[PDB]
C-alpha cells in the first residue's frame, strides 16, 4: 500500500480529515513554490530516471511524507483565512 497509511489515519480525528490536509498541503506545495517543504535535508522524495523527485513529481506524495513527520500542524482554525496567503507569498519565492 502507501507509506504509514495507518500512522497517518491515526493522526487525524476523522478519515476525511487526512484527505483534506494532504490535498490542501499539496496545493500550497505547488502554489507558493515547491521548496515550501520542511524536509529537504538527508532523506526526502526521490525518483530514478535520475534521482530528481527532489524537484516536482508528485506534490501529494510529499504532503503525506511530511505529515507523517511531526512538523506540520492541521487545525480547524489555526491561522486567519486571508492573512496566510499573504505571508506565505512573502517568504516562499519562485512562484
Amino acid at each position: 500500500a502507501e507509506p504509514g497509511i495507518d500512522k497517518l489515519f491515526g493522526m487525524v480525528d476523522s478519515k476525511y480529515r487526512l484527505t483534506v490536509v494532504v490535498a490542501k498541503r499539496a496545493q500550497q506545495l505547488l502554489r507558493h513554490g515547491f521548496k515550501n517543504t520542511v524536509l529537504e535535508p538527508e532523506e526526502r522524495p526521490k525518483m530514478q530516471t535520475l534521482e530528481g523527485l527532489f524537484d516536482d513529481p508528485n506534490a501529494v506524495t510529499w504532503a503525506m511524507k511530511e505529515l507523517l513527520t511531526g512538523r506540520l500542524v492541521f487545525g480547524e482554525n489555526l491561522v486567519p483565512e486571508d492573512r496566510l496567503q499573504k505571508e506565505m507569498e512573502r517568504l516562499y519565492p519562485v512562484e
Partner: protein, 37 residues
C-alpha cells in the same frame, strides 16, 4: 454540480488548514507588528 454534503464535503472538515512552524512564527510576527509606536 455542487460539492457533496457528505464525505470531504463534510462541514466538519471542509474547513481545515495546514501550516509549517516556519509560517507559524511568521504569522505572529505580523501580530507583533500590531504594536503601534
Amino acid at each position: 454540480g455542487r460539492l457533496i454534503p457528505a464525505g470531504t464535503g463534510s462541514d466538519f472538515v471542509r474547513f481545515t488548514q495546514v501550516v509549517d512552524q516556519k509560517t507559524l512564527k511568521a504569522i505572529e510576527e505580523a501580530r507583533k507588528e500590531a504594536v503601534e509606536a
